[PDB]
Curated annotation (Swiss-Prot):
<keyword id="KW-0408">Iron</keyword>
<dbReference type="GO" id="GO:0005344">
    <property type="term" value="F:oxygen carrier activity"/>
</dbReference>
<feature type="binding site" description="proximal binding residue">
    <location>
        <position position="93"/>
    </location>
    <ligand>
        <name>heme b</name>
    </ligand>
</feature>
<dbReference type="InterPro" id="IPR009050">
    <property type="entry name" value="Globin-like_sf"/>
</dbReference>
<keyword id="KW-0597">Phosphoprotein</keyword>
<feature type="modified residue" description="Phosphoserine">
    <location>
        <position position="3"/>
    </location>
</feature>
<feature type="modified residue" description="Phosphothreonine">
    <location>
        <position position="67"/>
    </location>
</feature>
<dbReference type="Pfam" id="PF00042">
    <property type="entry name" value="Globin"/>
</dbReference>
<protein>
    <recommendedName>
        <fullName>Myoglobin</fullName>
        <ecNumber>1.7.-.-</ecNumber>
        <ecNumber>1.11.1.-</ecNumber>
    </recommendedName>
</protein>
<feature type="domain" description="Globin">
    <location>
        <begin position="1"/>
        <end position="147"/>
    </location>
</feature>
<comment type="function">
    <text>Monomeric heme protein which primary function is to store oxygen and facilitate its diffusion within muscle tissues. Reversibly binds oxygen through a pentacoordinated heme iron and enables its timely and efficient release as needed during periods of heightened demand. Depending on the oxidative conditions of tissues and cells, and in addition to its ability to bind oxygen, it also has a nitrite reductase activity whereby it regulates the production of bioactive nitric oxide.</text>
</comment>
<dbReference type="GO" id="GO:0004601">
    <property type="term" value="F:peroxidase activity"/>
</dbReference>
<dbReference type="GO" id="GO:0019825">
    <property type="term" value="F:oxygen binding"/>
</dbReference>
<feature type="binding site">
    <location>
        <position position="64"/>
    </location>
    <ligand>
        <name>nitrite</name>
    </ligand>
</feature>
<feature type="binding site">
    <location>
        <position position="64"/>
    </location>
    <ligand>
        <name>O2</name>
    </ligand>
</feature>
<keyword id="KW-0561">Oxygen transport</keyword>
<dbReference type="GO" id="GO:0020037">
    <property type="term" value="F:heme binding"/>
</dbReference>
């Protein structure tokens, strides 16, 4: 779990993400993609830029990145109360997104990378540990939802 302090730190960092949700959103995906080709092959609309983003990966990347961060954002904002549901998103990433979490650990790395890159000095040990823990909770929540939905069970 995350303590009130850890949540406040997370929300503080996230206010910076949210302030430039689109930017973080794109950056995170671009980073994820360039780091792990397999994550890029997955999204048909991004996959077309086969060489992990032909230095474009925009407009649609923005739309998704925003959707994506807003969802994880809501989760984080709800400080443990698992997006009020999570289940529908667990279901998509379960059935369509190629079952196991895996890639969510890659986006966790991407998130940590963008955060550290854009917000050094303040995104220190405590902040990164807190964000990482929050991402781990998120991944763990999806893992539990995969059991509920009758996949991970
Ligand atoms: C921060 C973690 C993530 C969150 C909060 C998230 C959120 C979302 C949301 C809200 C949607 C649209 C509705 C839905 O289908 O559920 C979506 C779709 C999708 N997600 Fe994720 N997602 C996450 C991570 C991932 C990762 C790491 C991958 C693959 C590397 C992935 C691949 C997809 C795909 C392929 C779609 C379908 C739409 C697309 O082609 O753009 N997701 N995601």
């Amino acid at each position: 779990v995350l303590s009130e302090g850890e949540w406040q730190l997370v929300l503080h960092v996230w206010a910076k993400v949210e302030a430039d949700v689109a930017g973080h959103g794109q950056d995170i995906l671009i980073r994820l993609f360039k780091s792990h080709p397999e994550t890029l092959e997955k999204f048909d609309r991004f996959k077309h830029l086969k060489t992990e983003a032909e230095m474009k990966a925009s407009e649609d990347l923005k739309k998704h990145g925003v959707t994506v961060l807003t969802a994880l954002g809501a989760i984080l904002k709800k400080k443990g109360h698992h997006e009020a549901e999570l289940k529908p998103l667990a279901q998509s990433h379960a059935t369509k997104h190629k079952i196991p979490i895996k890639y969510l650990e890659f986006i966790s790395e991407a998130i940590i990378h963008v955060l550290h890159s854009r917000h050094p000095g303040d995104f220190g040990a405590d902040a990164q540990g807190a964000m990482n823990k929050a991402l781990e909770l998120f991944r763990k929540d999806i893992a539990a939802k995969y059991k509920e939905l009758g996949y991970q069970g």
